[PDB]
Amino acid sequence: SNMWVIGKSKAQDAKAIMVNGPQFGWYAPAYTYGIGLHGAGYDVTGNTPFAYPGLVFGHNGVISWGSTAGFGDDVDIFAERLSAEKPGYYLHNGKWVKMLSREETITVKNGQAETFTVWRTVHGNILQTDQTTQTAYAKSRAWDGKEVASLLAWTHQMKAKNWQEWTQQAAKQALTINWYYADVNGNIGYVHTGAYPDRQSGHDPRLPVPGTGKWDWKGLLPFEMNPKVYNPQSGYIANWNNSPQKDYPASDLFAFLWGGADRVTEIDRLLEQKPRLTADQAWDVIRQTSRQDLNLRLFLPTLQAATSGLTQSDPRRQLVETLTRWDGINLLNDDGKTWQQPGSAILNVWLTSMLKRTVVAAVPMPFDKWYSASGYETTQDGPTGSLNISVGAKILYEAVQGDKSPIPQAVDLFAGKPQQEVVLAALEDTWETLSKRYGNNVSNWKTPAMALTFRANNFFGVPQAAAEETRHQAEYQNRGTENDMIVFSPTTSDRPVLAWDVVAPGQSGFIAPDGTVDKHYEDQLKMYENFGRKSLWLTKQDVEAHKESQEVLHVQR
Amino acid sequence: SSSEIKIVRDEYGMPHIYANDTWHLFYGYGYVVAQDRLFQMEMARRSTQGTVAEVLGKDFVKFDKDIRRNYWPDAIRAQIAALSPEDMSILQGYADGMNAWIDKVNTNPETLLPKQFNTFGFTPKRWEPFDVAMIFVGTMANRFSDSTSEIDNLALLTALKDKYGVSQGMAVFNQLKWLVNPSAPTTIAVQES
Ligand SMILES: [Ca+2]
Numbered sequence: 006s007n008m009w010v011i012g013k014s015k016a017q018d019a020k021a022i023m024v025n026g027p028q029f030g031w032y033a034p035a036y037t038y039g040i041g042l043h044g045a046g047y048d049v050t051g052n053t054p055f056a057y058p059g060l061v062f063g064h065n066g067v068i069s070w071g072s073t074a075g076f077g078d079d080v081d082i083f084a085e086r087l088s089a090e091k092p093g094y095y096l097h098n099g100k101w102v103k104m105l106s107r108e109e110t111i112t113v114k115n116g117q118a119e120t121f122t123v124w125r126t127v128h129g130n131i132l133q134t135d136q137t138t139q140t141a142y143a144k145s146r147a148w149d150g151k152e153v154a155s156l157l158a159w160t161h162q163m164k165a166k167n168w169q170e171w172t173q174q175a176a177k178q179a180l181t182i183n184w185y186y187a188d189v190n191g192n193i194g195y196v197h198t199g200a201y202p203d204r205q206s207g208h209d210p211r212l213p214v215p216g217t218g219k220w221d222w223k224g225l226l227p228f229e230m231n232p233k234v235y236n237p238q239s240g241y242i243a244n245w246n247n248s249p250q251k252d253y254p255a256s257d258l259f260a261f262l263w264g265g266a267d268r269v270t271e272i273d274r275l276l277e278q279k280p281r282l283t284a285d286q287a288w289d290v291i292r293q294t295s296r297q298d299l300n301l302r303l304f305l306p307t308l309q310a311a312t313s314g315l316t317q318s319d320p321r322r323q324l325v326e327t328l329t330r331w332d333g334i335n336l337l338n339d340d341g342k343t344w345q346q347p348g349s350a351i352l353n354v355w356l357t358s359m360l361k362r363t364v365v366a367a368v369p370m371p372f373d374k375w376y377s378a379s380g381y382e383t384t385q386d387g388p389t390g391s392l393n394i395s396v397g398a399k400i401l402y403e404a405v406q407g408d409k410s411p412i413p414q415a416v417d418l419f420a421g422k423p424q425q426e427v428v429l430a431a432l433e434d435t436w437e438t439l440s441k442r443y444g445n446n447v448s449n450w451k452t453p454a455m456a457l458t459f460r461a462n463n464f465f466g467v468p469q470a471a472a473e474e475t476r477h478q479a480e481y482q483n484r485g486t487e488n489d490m491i492v493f494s495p496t497t498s499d500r501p502v503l504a505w506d507v508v509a510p511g512q513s514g515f516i517a518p519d520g521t522v523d524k525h526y527e528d529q530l531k532m533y534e535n536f537g538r539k540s541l542w543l544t545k546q547d548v549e550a551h552k553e554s555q556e557v558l559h560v561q562r
Numbered sequence: 563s564s565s566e567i568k569i570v571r572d573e574y575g576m577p578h579i580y581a582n583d584t585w586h587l588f589y590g591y592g593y594v595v596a597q598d599r600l601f602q603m604e605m606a607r608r609s610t611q612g613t614v615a616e617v618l619g620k621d622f623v624k625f626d627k628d629i630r631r632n633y634w635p636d637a638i639r640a641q642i643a644a645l646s647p648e649d650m651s652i653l654q655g656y657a658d659g660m661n662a663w664i665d666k667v668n669t670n671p672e673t674l675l676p677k678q679f680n681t682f683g684f685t686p687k688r689w690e691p692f693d694v695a696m697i698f699v700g701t702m703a704n705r706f707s708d709s710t711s712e713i714d715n716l717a718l719l720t721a722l723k724d725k726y727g728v729s730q731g732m733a734v735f736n737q738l739k740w741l742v743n744p745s746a747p748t749t750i751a752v753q754e755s
Contacts, residue, residue: 257712512575
């Protein structure tokens, strides 16, 4: 999930520009819901996931807000000590404490019903138990019991009129989420929000801790500790689920790392490029980053150095020259199914081969399968979410940095061979594989493009529409599920704020009993595909001016 | 009036709610959501509470059990019970709004019932404040803030110690799953903090 916020000093013909592309997968009917709320202290416009009471993306005519997943470490596992005798008890602070339990009945359409028990300790619900060790794992969340307050902080922030009021609400959001701010005066801000544990000294947050007492968190860290910036010296704020600040520790997921190879660099490159950006230029970064190969930049120097002393008639040198001629931007051919350049196919084969010879080789089975992905995933429906640099690829980047890398190389991943020799061997594998399928003439390689699918099943894998409701887009775009832009103090208008969004397929998922589809069921689908956008209205006169219908209700509590 | 809720839809169908109080404002929101996205919302309610096997069958029993094991319903109810009346209005407003429209739908299903309820062979039930809160808890708290692989990391670490010995196993662990990496590109510049 990406975001770019541009302040006074970087903005051209406006005072502040906010562009958000939350990435949640692509669904039919839309993941988010468009809504404007005027009354009881609220005056907002925007869209929000699952029509939550609070709007994750929008503005109130004074300030604008947005979000991106935080990925801080806010969950720890407690190894609970059970006795063989005296069951449903666990040892805590030298006493055998009884567990909370609840019975549950799963009713099944056309099958027998099923019942089970859920167990809970002071640390959290029990995940799994190992009756051989006499250990049970309880999952402890720093936000346990602040779920409802997090929702309400997301709602009350819509009424803030300045940074001061806005951060009072940011302080109550307990989930690990990045929050972004912009205002009518050109002020911009960022807060890495959430509840984080105050851990015991010598607690390694990557691995379980005994739940017998000594390892129990001391409490939660204060909000003064949460990374934040207000009106940064650069004139902008960019994030693509990268580290908030220097030395901030990421989630404990084995598959998640914050290293020198990060996709946020692709955004930075573009924002530093122009001294000032207009709104169209700010919107335009969505198109470029949507189409950018993420590995080109990281490994081109490595491939260039390795093939420098090779002959022109050497196929491994040819392949690097193709990539050298390429900008990394994927474009579809006229056929709507293949890419213009073979770069991504080359990097995908090369990278898979490199991983198998280096990272995969150093890790015992079956942990070796965690590091073998190149990050070019997909099926026929294309990727289920965003494209990123794989974990194996981030670890291989540090290795190819040698001594320029801050990560001590305990095992030499190249296993005593010079780097160049492993690179050339992987390049030989690439050539052998690709030449076999497409031929020897690299210039006529017509490689398959990734596609986009608006799925009928929600993210849980549960149907939220009929299978036939599934929509397909020819070009895969590494962008938000929705994209929204807020422009404060345009010099171009009389209006103090301008805002746009796109909610595809459409606003409504309604289908009448006879099979009659709503008028707004899919009127935003083509707009999505060609990087278009629709105006978001706030004021009564704009709303009135654009009204298509009215409904008045008289209800009393 | 205080009883009045005006609903204006724009050229894209995006609803705008005009109301004088909190309960009336959230009622309006709930009402248009039930108009636009009832089947989606209903399926999102069953997904977040682990009630998919009831209407969908055998295939969702494991899903249902996994959802239920990952939360404590009673802890959620207690947070709702502790809300102030203004805070409570948002949730009650919302559920009420939705219910208003579910009553008309269930009254005149020959024209108002979402086609998919017929397809899937079930009908919409009324919502309570707990249901609204669970939509957020289940798709925001469990989707993006419930991430850990600590038991798996321990398994990996144990395998590295069996391969490189104790000290070496640990140093390889730090090369694969480092705590911090000082070269990572950051949102906040180092001059800032
Ligand atoms: Ca942890």
